[PDB]
Amino acid sequence: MKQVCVLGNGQLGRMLRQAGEPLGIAVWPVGLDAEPAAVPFQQSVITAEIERWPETALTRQLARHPAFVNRDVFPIIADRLTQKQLFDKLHLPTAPWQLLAERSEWPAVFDRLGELAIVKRRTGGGQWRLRANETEQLPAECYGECIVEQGINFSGEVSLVGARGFDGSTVFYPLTHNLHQDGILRTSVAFPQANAQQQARAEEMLSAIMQELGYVGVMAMECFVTPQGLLINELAPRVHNSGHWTQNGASISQFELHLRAITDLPLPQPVVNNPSVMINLIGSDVNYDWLKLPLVHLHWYDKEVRPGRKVGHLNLTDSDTSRLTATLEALIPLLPPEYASGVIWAQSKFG
Amino acid sequence: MKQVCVLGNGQLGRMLRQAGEPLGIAVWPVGLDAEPAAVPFQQSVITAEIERWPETALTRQLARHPAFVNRDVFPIIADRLTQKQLFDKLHLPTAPWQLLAERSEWPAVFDRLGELAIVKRRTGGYDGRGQWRLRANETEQLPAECYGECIVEQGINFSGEVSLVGARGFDGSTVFYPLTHNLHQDGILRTSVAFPQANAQQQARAEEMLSAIMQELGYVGVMAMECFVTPQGLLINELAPRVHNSGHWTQNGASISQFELHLRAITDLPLPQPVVNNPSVMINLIGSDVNYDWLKLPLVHLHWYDKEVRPGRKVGHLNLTDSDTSRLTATLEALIPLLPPEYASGVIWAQSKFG
Numbered sequence: 001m002k003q004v005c006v007l008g009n010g011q012l013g014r015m016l017r018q019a020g021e022p023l024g025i026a027v028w029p030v031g032l033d034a035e036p037a038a039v040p041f042q043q044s045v046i047t048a049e050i051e052r053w054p055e056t057a058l059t060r061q062l063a064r065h066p067a068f069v070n071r072d073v074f075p076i077i078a079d080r081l082t083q084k085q086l087f088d089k090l091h092l093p094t095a096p097w098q099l100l101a102e103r104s105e106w107p108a109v110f111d112r113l114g115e116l117a118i119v120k121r122r123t124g125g126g127q128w129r130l131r132a133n134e135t136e137q138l139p140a141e142c143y144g145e146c147i148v149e150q151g152i153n154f155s156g157e158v159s160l161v162g163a164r165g166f167d168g169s170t171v172f173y174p175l176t177h178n179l180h181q182d183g184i185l186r187t188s189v190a191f192p193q194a195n196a197q198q199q200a201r202a203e204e205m206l207s208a209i210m211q212e213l214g215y216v217g218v219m220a221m222e223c224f225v226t227p228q229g230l231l232i233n234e235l236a237p238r239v240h241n242s243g244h245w246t247q248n249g250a251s252i253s254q255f256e257l258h259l260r261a262i263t264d265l266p267l268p269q270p271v272v273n274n275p276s277v278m279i280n281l282i283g284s285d286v287n288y289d290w291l292k293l294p295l296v297h298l299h300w301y302d303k304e305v306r307p308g309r310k311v312g313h314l315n316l317t318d319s320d321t322s323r324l325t326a327t328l329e330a331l332i333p334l335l336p337p338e339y340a341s342g343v344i345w346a347q348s349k350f351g
Numbered sequence: 352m353k354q355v356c357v358l359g360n361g362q363l364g365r366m367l368r369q370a371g372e373p374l375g376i377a378v379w380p381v382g383l384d385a386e387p388a389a390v391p392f393q394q395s396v397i398t399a400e401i402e403r404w405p406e407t408a409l410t411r412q413l414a415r416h417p418a419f420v421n422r423d424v425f426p427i428i429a430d431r432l433t434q435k436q437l438f439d440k441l442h443l444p445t446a447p448w449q450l451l452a453e454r455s456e457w458p459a460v461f462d463r464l465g466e467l468a469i470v471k472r473r474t475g476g477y478d479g480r481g482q483w484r485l486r487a488n489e490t491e492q493l494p495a496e497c498y499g500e501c502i503v504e505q506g507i508n509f510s511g512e513v514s515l516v517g518a519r520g521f522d523g524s525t526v527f528y529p530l531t532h533n534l535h536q537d538g539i540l541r542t543s544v545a546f547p548q549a550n551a552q553q554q555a556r557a558e559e560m561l562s563a564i565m566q567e568l569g570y571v572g573v574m575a576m577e578c579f580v581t582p583q584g585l586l587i588n589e590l591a592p593r594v595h596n597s598g599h600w601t602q603n604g605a606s607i608s609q610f611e612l613h614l615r616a617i618t619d620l621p622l623p624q625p626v627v628n629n630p631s632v633m634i635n636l637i638g639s640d641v642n643y644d645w646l647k648l649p650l651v652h653l654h655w656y657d658k659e660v661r662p663g664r665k666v667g668h669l670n671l672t673d674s675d676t677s678r679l680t681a682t683l684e685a686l687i688p689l690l691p692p693e694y695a696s697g698v699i700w701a702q703s704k705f706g
């Protein structure tokens with residue numbers, strides 16, 4: 001049978017466990033502080049809902065564990081330097097970049113990357129956007145530990161969520177449009193038919209990366225839409241926030257898909273017929289008033305509400321798009337004010 | 352948060368728990384063997400996933416608790432004699448029947464009710480168990496203790512069976528799903544098919560009947576009303592004061608499932624009308640082992656109950672829903688060679704609805 005242990009105790013692991021239950025797959029999400037005992041590791045397929053972790057009592061036991069799918073891929077992707085090098089190695093479009101080694105480097109960096117430099121920690125996410133006058137602000141700790149790239153002026157951001165099976169087969173969801181405010185995802189919208197050139201471009205780059213890594217399971221590739229096409233921003237070797245809409249807007253969710261892949265169950269293409277919109281709930285308390293609107297699917301994480309914390313998400317799907325945007329309209333006043341703009345941005349794509 | 356304890360830990364209680372977790376409602380399906388001291392029922396909204404129960408330490412405490420929504424209603428619906436009298440009281444058409452109280456009545460039963468008598472136990476029957484179909488020559492098959500504890504009805508030659516699944520809130524408001532077409536074989540549900548828009552007249556009559564019942568009883572939560580489609584219209588077959596097998600398709604084919612609807616009603620949350628745009632088909636899995644080959648068909652939603660697999664036991668269901676019905680028929684076709692032989696007729700029966 002289907003026994004799965006998930007390294008990491010956050011909402012992604014919870015949604016995976018909720019997904020496996022009606023499939024008859026028992027999923028055990030475990031925190032890094034756990035005792036290796038309470039972990040049915042020795043008889044499970046092992047996966048993670050996190051990207052990197054230190055050696056802990058529990059994790060040490062996971063080192064070289066043969067049931068840990070993709071065990072060896074994580075670190076390649078967890079360090080932005082090696083992740084960017086992978087795109088370069090595959091000749092995949094990505095923002096121009098370099099290791100930011102020393103303050104010495106700034107003028108050339110500016111010369112070459114343009115006016116705005118996006119500095120990102122190599123591991124553990126962690127970002128600064130700087131102009132030549134502002135460089136002092138970057139902590140001295142970053143030198144040697146961050147990459148820096150051209151700030152991309154994209155028209156929008158989209159991510160491709162898909163999965164690759166042990167046999168190399170691949171399946172994908174339509175691209176999803178995502179809006180980030182203060183570096184965090186606030187809203188996502190997916191249409192059953194995306195721009196065909198874009199979709200094709202994304203599936204070919206993601207297939208190429210998954211094949212290269214020998215990856216099995218769900219992976220998300222976030223990209224920037226530019227006049228020249230998509231540029232790859234970053235990868236997530238796991239189910240990703242942008243794909244949550246799949247819980248109610250696809251015949252197979254990203255959670256079920258990930259489980260199917262790693263346990264070697266059937267991996268047909270998920271069916272997506274209507275559009276969906278996802279609104280992330282961040283630092284807000286649950287408001288059951290939202291459930292007055294029948295299209296609203298509430299996904300509460302049962303985490304403590306704190307500022308800037310992802311506490312849940314709302315999914316809405318419908319073949320009637322007038323009904324859908326009307327609902328979004330009705331939802332606005334039921335949410336705290338900082339939600340409005342991302343809702344309006346979502347409604348705008350239905351035009 | 353919302354905290355709910357359910358009397359019973361069968362598949363219905365499990366699916367109510369699954370529905371609640373994402374809404375932030377902690378739901379505890381409680382087995383009848385639980386020690387009351389070990390269940391937070393005194394701090395919860397209490398409900399039931401079963402109609403009747405034996406007396407155990409846990410049942411004694413829960414069933415009398417003031418937090419048990421519809422506590423005083425269950426007795427009436429749970430006994431088929433009072434359930435039928437209730438239909439009669441509200442002028443609700445139903446099969447001619449009477450209480451089977453003594454052998455001396457048999458001949459009158461047959462004279463009045465026709466060639467086959469349908470005997471149902473007054474309480475504890477579900478899944479087509481606690482029911483016998485008898486010809487005059489077979490009354491010997493009836494357990495002596497049945498006399499006085501069973502009702503007997505005319506065998507109705509319905510052209511089809513449909514059920515109305517709906518809910519009533521503390522505020523008296525009600526919402527309903529479209530009618531669900533149900534196929535039973537050997538008295539157990541095998542397949543359900545629901546369409547976004549049902550026969551309006553039939554949908555209107557059924558709703559009128561269930562609204563009458565729920566309001567007479569002062570019922571809060573989900574209720575299912577199973578009927579027979581005959582040439583004189585619908586007749587009510589029986590009621591289920593809870594989420595019901597024929598409503599399972601709502602997990603994937605409606606915007607709010609029957610499980611979420613029941614939790615909303617009982618916890619006093621909003622009760623809007625669920626949105627249903629496409630048809631859905633539900634295939635019940637009875638006494639069969641799980642076969643992951645089913646997942647090779649992308650529209651299939653597997654709902655495995657993690658229950659012991661043995662003859663006549665409901666072990667899960669498969670839901671399929673899509674706007675393209677050709678997709679559905681095609682998937683139903685593909686499922687036949689992936690299921691035990693006894694499933695073919697029910698699957699074909701569902702495919703037939705779309706042609």
Ligand SMILES: Nc1ncnc2c1ncn2[C@@H]1O[C@H](COP(=O)(O)OP(=O)(O)O)[C@@H](O)[C@H]1O
Pocket residue numbers: 095118120125127149150151152153157180183222233234
């Ligand atoms: N080079 C860049 N140019 C412009 N914006 C960027 C660039 N890199 C990141 N961003 C913006 O920052 C967001 C978060 O950055 P990302 O690298 O995906 O970090 P994280 O791992 O924290 O999600 C992006 O989705 C995008 O909005």
Ligand SMILES: Nc1ncnc2c1ncn2[C@@H]1O[C@H](COP(=O)(O)OP(=O)(O)O)[C@@H](O)[C@H]1O
Pocket residue numbers: 446469471476477478479480482504505506507508512535538539577588589
């Ligand atoms: N009077 C009746 N006439 C013909 N068939 C009936 C009658 N009562 C029940 N049945 C058949 O038996 C099925 C189960 O009966 P029901 O009373 O619903 O019992 P249960 O509570 O076990 O589900 C019905 O759905 C129908 O197919």
Ligand SMILES: O=P([O-])([O-])O
Pocket residue numbers: 222236240241
């Ligand atoms: O990393 P993210 O943030 O999920 O993208």
Ligand SMILES: O=P([O-])([O-])O
Pocket residue numbers: 476477478479577591595596
């Ligand atoms: O069997 P039921 O009672 O109908 O569920």
Ligand SMILES: [Cl-]
Pocket residue numbers: 398399400572573592593594613
């Ligand atoms: Cl119920």
Ligand SMILES: [Mg+2]
Pocket residue numbers: 222234
């Ligand atoms: Mg990102």
Ligand SMILES: [Mg+2]
Pocket residue numbers: 125234235236
């Ligand atoms: Mg990231």
Ligand SMILES: [Mg+2]
Pocket residue numbers: 476477478589590591
């Ligand atoms: Mg019954």
Ligand SMILES: [Mg+2]
Pocket residue numbers: 478577589
């Ligand atoms: Mg019944």
